[PDB]
């Protein structure tokens, strides 16, 4: 509704009705780079490290402990 009015198109009640862009691209690209950098760093990285655990984490923890056990036992004698 608002944007219907922003132009010099109607400007009258119905009763009384009768280079130039290379530099712009230059700065716009920098703005785009900044925005995409901020987004990638701030959401698809930062919010990934906020998800709940699952059975994979159990497997990996227990397996790593077991491997460390085997290495220590092997190097003891």
């Amino acid at each position: 509704l608002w944007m219907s009015y922003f132009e010099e198109g109607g400007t009258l009640p119905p009763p009384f009705n009768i280079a130039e862009n290379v530099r712009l691209n230059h700065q716009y690209q920098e703005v785009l780079r900044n925005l995409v950098k901020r987004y990638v760093a701030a959401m698809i990285r930062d919010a990934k490290t906020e998800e709940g655990l699952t059975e994979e984490n159990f497997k990996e923890l227990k397996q790593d402990i077991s491997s460390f056990r085997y290495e220590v036992i092997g190097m003891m004698k």
């Binding site: 900044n34 950098k37 901020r38 990638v40 760093a41 701030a42 990285r45």
Partner: protein, 130 residues
């Protein structure tokens, strides 16, 4: 980088200590890599140590005077007490120019940091009423 910093970052993140130290005082003399590269996602090795809260690596890195940046802010967000415990005494970032240590500290209710920074002494700005 140049498959030279990759080993350094991997050692820092994996938890190694001797290898990291050796890399520090090797590149300190061969002037081969910068200590403060950010390859993967703009992650200084200091930040990598911060987010794994591994105190030994952080305190070692403070010895070599690697550039700190706004790592204090990252530690504050992460809610790690030892990191700010160390950092306290002595280009374009991802944090709004407005935020100061106390503002972000208050943004997260965590008694310890608020008490510490009050001990050091700050003064949060006040708005003008309308």
């Amino acid at each position: 980088l140049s498959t030279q910093e990759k080993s350094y970052l991997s050692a820092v993140e994996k938890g190694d200590y001797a290898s990291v130290k050796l890399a520090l005082e090797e590149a300190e003399i061969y002037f081969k890599i910068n200590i403060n590269c950010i390859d993967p996602l703009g992650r200084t090795a200091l930040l990598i140590a911060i987010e794994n809260e591994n105190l030994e690596i952080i305190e070692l890195l403070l010895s070599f005077n690697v550039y700190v940046g706004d790592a204090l802010l990252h530690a504050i967000r992460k809610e790690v007490v030892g990191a700010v415990e160390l950092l306290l005494n002595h280009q374009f970032s991802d944090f709004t120019p407005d935020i100061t240590p106390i503002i972000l500290a208050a943004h997260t209710n965590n008694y310890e940091i608020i008490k510490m920074l009050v001990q050091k002494g700050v003064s949060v700005p006040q708005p003008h009423e309308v």
